[PDB]
């Protein structure tokens, strides 16, 4: 069963990564204290799908956020420069261009 | 830019894109909030379930396997007063397995030394630890904990 | 009605006996065996039950009369998520070569079936018919990386279909699929960003991000994220 153990460790890595991200975030972790004994039927596959999707979507959004932040800040600075450039030309507007 | 129309082109191109990117940033951050709340609502139970499954598989890896018999062989230590409850746990496991033909719990003549157990309680735990600090008592010798 | 373990095993044994033949395999499709047994293969874990479902699937794919018939059976199986549990059983091991051969045959044929489904011609047919309903080609990256340029054929006919649906579609499934496919086209044909700008897909997805449906919003947000990745 060490293969199933390894799968459980992969699951635990997923969950701990998500938990670390939650700690980094402000949303609380709930302490309800529910203590069910896990059944034998393959709830493992459903839980693997759920953990995988949760962590994967978290990763993808986290990665994309940085790129969007960078580009938005770049465009903001470009907008500011574009604003001030015309003031720097503010002497006499005779030419058509 | 170099010319007024180039300046206007770039100004518009950035003025749309900045608002577009801010919009998507804010909505995607709200999506982060929603999904992360959904995760945090259930992570503890997820953690407990995964840890229980890990423990179950690991403890199963201690048994003898199809290499010996298609049904597993295992060995346990238990306090005698709880043999009925242990057999009841075995009954519960077989019930969850769904087999009509039942399982079996076996006693045997043993050569290994029994461990020591005390049924500690909230009040006496510190004292039991204090006496355990210098070696746990042998099977059924007088415990110095109740006198200490 | 979810009878007991032995009764389920015996009934799937019956199904395996029927599936040994082409004609009965062909005529008994009407009962949609595959999804029920897909769920039962996870619930009723018992090895006899698992083995007999896999054998029934193998017989179905063996004796289905046409290549198309085997393709319906395999398409139903993949839509019902058989392939992932086949991978899991492959990770697992069993004490006879029979289960091994059943698993390997079903795995190889599921792979071949998804490869067939990934045909760019079948993607074109699906787009033409409007059947934007999450066929495996949609989430087959292998098709996308190689064929993203081919959508430009016939003066971008497939992209025009996608973008037109991105304004015509009231169907949540079709609309979300179209948004995701626009995202994938951006992801796998970088030159197509100007094409989607010209066809209006950029703005259409930027609008459908505010769509009333969670799935449509989710896919449109993904696509627009892939869109704004570069200057």
Summarize the entry for a quick read.
The structure is cut from a larger assembly and holds two copies of chain A and one copy of chain C (231 residues). With 97 residues, chain A is mainly α.
Question: Could you explain how this protein is built, in words?
Answer:
The structure is cut from a larger assembly and holds two copies of chain A and one copy of chain C (231 residues). By secondary structure, chain A is mainly alpha-helical. Chain A has two helices and no strands. Chain A has helices spanning 2-24, 43-89. In chain A, helix 1 (2-24) runs parallel beside helix 2. The termini of chain A are far apart. Chain C is an all-alpha fold. Chain C contains 14 helices and no strands. The interface between A and B is large, with 52 and 47 residues. It is classed as proton transport. The entry lists the keywords Vesicle, synaptic, membrane, proton transport. The entry is titled "Synaptic Vesicle V-ATPase with synaptophysin and SidK, State 1". Chains A, B are V-type proton ATPase 116 kDa subunit a isoform 1. Organism of A, B: Rattus norvegicus.
**Cα shape of chain A:** rod-shaped
Structural class of chain A: mainly alpha
Main beta-sheet strand count, sense and barrel state of chain A: none
Q: Which band does the percent of strand residues of chain A land in?
A: under 5%
Q: How far is the first residue's CA from the last residue's CA of chain C?
A: 59 Å
Largest interface: A-B, 52 and 47 residues
Can you summarize the main beta sheet of chain C?
A: none
Q: Helix count of chain A?
A: 2
Q: Find the count of extended strands of chain C (DSSP E, 2+ residues).
A: 0
Question: Secondary-structure element order of chain A, as H and E?
Answer: HH
Number of strands of chain A: 0
Number of distinct helices of chain C: 14
Radius of gyration of chain C: 21 Å
Estimated radius of gyration of chain A: 26 Å
Beta content of chain C comes to: under 5%
Oligomer: part of a larger assembly
Family (chain A): Belongs to the V-ATPase 116 kDa subunit family.
Subcellular location (chain A): Cytoplasmic vesicle, Clathrin-coated vesicle membrane; Cytoplasmic vesicle, Secretory vesicle, Synaptic vesicle membrane; Melanosome
Protein name (chain A): V-type proton ATPase 116 kDa subunit a 1
Organism (chain A): Rattus norvegicus
């Amino acid at each position: 069963f060490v293969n199933e153990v390894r799968r459980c460790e992969e699951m635990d890595r997923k969950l701990r990564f998500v938990e670390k991200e939650i700690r980094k975030a402000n949303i609380p972790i709930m302490d309800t204290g529910e203590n069910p004994e896990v059944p034998f039927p393959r709830d493992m596959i459903d839980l693997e799908a759920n953990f995988e999707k949760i962590e994967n979507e978290l990763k993808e959004i986290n990665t994309n956020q940085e790129a969007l932040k960078r580009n938005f800040l770049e465009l903001t600075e470009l907008k500011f420069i574009l604003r001030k450039t015309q003031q720097f030309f503010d002497e006499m507007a005779d030419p058509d261009l | 830019p170099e010319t007024p129309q180039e300046r206007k082109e770039m100004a518009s191109g950035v003025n749309t894109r900045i608002d577009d990117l801010q919009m998507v940033l804010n909505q995607t951050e709200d999506h982060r909030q929603r999904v992360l709340q959904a995760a945090a609502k259930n992570i503890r139970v997820w953690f407990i379930k995964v840890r229980k499954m890990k423990a179950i598989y690991h403890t199963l890896n201690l048994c003898n396997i199809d290499v010996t018999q298609k049904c597993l062989i295992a060995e346990v230590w238990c306090p005698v007063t709880d043999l009925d409850s242990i057999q009841f746990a075995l009954r519960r496991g077989t019930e969850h397995s769904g087999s009509t033909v039942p399982s079996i719990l076996n006693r045997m003549q043993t050569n290994q030394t029994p461990p020591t157990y005390n049924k500690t309680n909230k009040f006496t735990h510190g004292f039991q630890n204090i006496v355990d600090a210098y070696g746990i008592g042998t099977y059924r010798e007088i415990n110095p904990a109740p006198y200490t | 009605n979810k009878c007991g373990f032995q009764l389920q095993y015996q009934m799937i044994f019956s199904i395996w006996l029927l599936a040994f033949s082409p004609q009965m395999c062909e005529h008994l499709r009407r009962y949609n065996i595959i999804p029920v047994l897909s769920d039962i293969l996870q619930e009723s874990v018992k090895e006899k039950v698992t083995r007999i479902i896999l054998a029934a699937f193998r017989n179905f794919l063996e004796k289905s009369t046409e290549r198309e018939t085997r393709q319906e059976y395999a398409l139903a199986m993949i839509q019902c998520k058989v392939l992932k549990q086949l991978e899991n059983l492959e990770q697992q091991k069993y004490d006879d070569e029979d289960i091994s051969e059943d698993i390997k045959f079903l795995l190889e044929k599921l792979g071949e079936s998804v490869q067939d489904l990934s045909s760019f011609d079948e993607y074109s047919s699906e787009l033409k018919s409007g059947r934007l309903e999450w066929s495996p080609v949609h989430k087959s990256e292998k098709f996308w990386r190689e064929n993203a340029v081919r959508l430009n054929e016939k003066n971008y006919e497939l992209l025009k279909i996608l973008t037109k649906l991105l304004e015509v579609s009231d169907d949540p499934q079709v609309l979300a699929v179209a948004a995701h496919d626009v995202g994938e086209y951006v992801r796998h044909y970088p030159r197509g960003k100007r094409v989607i700008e010209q066809l209006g897909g950029k703005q259409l997805v930027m609008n459908h991000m505010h769509h009333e449906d969670q799935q449509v919003r989710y896919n449109a947000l993904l696509a627009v994220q892939k869109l704004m990745v570069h200057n």
